From a paper:
BMP9, a member of the TGFβ superfamily, is a homodimer that forms a signaling complex with two type I and two type II receptors. Signaling through high-affinity activin receptor-like kinase 1 (ALK1) in endothelial cells, circulating BMP9 acts as a vascular quiescence factor, maintaining endothelial homeostasis. BMP9 is produced by hepatocytes as the prepro-form and is processed by proprotein convertase in the trans-Golgi network into prodomain and mature BMP9 ligand. The endothelial ALK1/BMPR-II pathway is constitutively activated by circulating BMP9, the only confirmed BMP that circulates at active concentrations.
Here, we showed by chromatography and a 1.9 Å crystal structure that stable BMP9 dimers could form either with (D-form) or without (M-form) an intermolecular disulfide bond. A single crystal contained both D- and M-forms of HBMP9. Because two previously published BMP9 structures were either in the M-form or the D-form and crystallized under different protein-protein interaction contexts, our crystal is unique in addressing the local differences between D- and M-forms of BMP9 under identical conditions. We solved the structure to 1.9 Å with a space group I4122. Indeed, Cys-73, the critical amino acid involved in disulfide bond formation, was in two conformations as demonstrated by clear electron density, with an intermolecular disulfide bond formed between the two monomers in one of the conformations. Interestingly, no other major difference could be observed for the remaining residues between the D- and M-forms. Overlaying the HBMP9 structure with the previously published BMP9 structures revealed that the core regions of BMP9 were almost identical. Loops contacting the type I and type II receptors had diverged conformations. These are also the regions with the highest B factors in all BMP9 structures, indicating an intrinsically higher degree of flexibility at these regions.
Residue numbers in the entry:
A (entry chain A), B (entry chain A): 4 to 110
């Protein structure tokens, strides 16, 4: 094998990130994260874009002058949050988009 | 201001990256790259996903245990390439997708 950009656990506490004046509930959620490398040889269990492949090759050849491809979320999922509105009313946002990692990849 | 994830020049030579047995022309192309940081405060000239914002906050708080959001291509464009087929014939691939950066963002 070789490199392994993959989804791993990341639990986030809203108070810790300064959002608790606005997000009442939940207190914490599973955001996940993408970690691991993008270097050859790759996983036959993912697909980078051609640009990521190109950049990976150039980085191997000229490491000081172009950076690596980066392991990032390529698809995200919503969560539900209970938030204080402007009239100060607790309101359910049923699908708060872009909150949790669904898929990771090299980009 | 603050962080600045942005598109910058990156010219790529196909021979240098080992592709010249397959790509006859062009010899080089403008792939571009995305460089710069994803840290607060952000550009009012881009939009990260909520997960990137969340991860940026957690990284600020707990830097040794979650990594930063990463500046990556968020949209790509094709180029035309002249390639040797299997019968060894030079053939135009008019839109070879995913080859050049169109837009960058923090993810």
């Amino acid at each position: 094998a070789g490199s392994h950009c993959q989804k791993t656990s990341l639990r986030v506490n809203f108070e810790d990130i300064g959002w608790d004046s606005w997000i009442i509930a939940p207190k914490e959620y599973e955001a996940y994260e993408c970690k691991g490398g993008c270097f050859f040889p790759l996983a036959d269990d993912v697909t980078p874009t051609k640009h990521a492949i190109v950049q990976t090759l150039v980085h191997l050849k000229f490491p000081t002058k172009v950076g690596k491809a980066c392991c990032v979320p390529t698809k995200l999922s919503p969560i539900s949050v209970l938030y204080k509105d402007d009239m100060g009313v607790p309101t359910l946002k049923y699908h708060y988009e872009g909150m949790s990692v669904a898929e990771c990849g090299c980009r």
